[PDB]
Design a protein around this nucleic acid. Structure first.
Lengths: 100, 100
DNA sequence: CTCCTCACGTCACGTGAGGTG
DNA sequence: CTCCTCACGTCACGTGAGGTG
């Protein structure tokens, strides 16, 4: 089980992000301490990677919730990255013609 | 000279975006009609492409203003796209190992 | 030092509210 | 039908405000 600081450090997100996702009901710690400090599990870490993945490809957090709550995500994750790589490649292609 | 509708259609941005960038002082029409309707020039269209470019690579609009107001942007624009293509390629690489 | 909960601020707009030729 | 200016709403948080072991 991991603290907000730990997970902030592992995922590379601010603690506030980890509070927000909790308040939203997108990512909710398994339990909290006798004091009330959050405890994230490995399940929660796996989950956070997925969240952060879809986030980086611009999915709004309502949709990210939906996507994640409907086993081969990997298929669509590959397709999205390929779409996006190709898009930038076309942009970068446009840059190279400008440089000529 | 072009209306907000026209430019909205050319750039593929909402009219509200074109109002916001005006209010911010990021993109300000050359003049307005006897009625007060905005008039964007070709200079303004060129400019909007740059804005929208840096926007897509996640630059906040204050920084986008700064970048654009300091002739070979193309150098840095290529470097950014290459960084980003490589990043996704690494992500997509991680996907392919997951699929094994 | 990191943990907390309120709670108001922010950035990039969205979305009507009511009025113009 | 698109143009307008206020002006309040929104999403994804940021950033103190004051209190805990």
């Amino acid at each position: 089980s991991y603290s907000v600081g730990q997970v902030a450090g592992f995922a590379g997100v601010t603690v506030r992000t980890l509070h927000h996702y909790d308040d939203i009901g997108l990512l909710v710690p398994s339990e909290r301490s006798h004091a009330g400090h959050r405890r994230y599990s490995d399940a929660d870490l796996d989950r956070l990677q997925q969240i952060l993945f879809y986030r980086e490809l611009g999915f709004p957090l309502d949709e990210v919730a939906a996507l994640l709550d409907d086993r081969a995500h990997l298929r669509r994750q590959h397709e999205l990255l390929s779409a996006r790589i190709g898009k930038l490649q076309k942009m970068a292609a446009a840059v190279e013609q400008a440089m000529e």
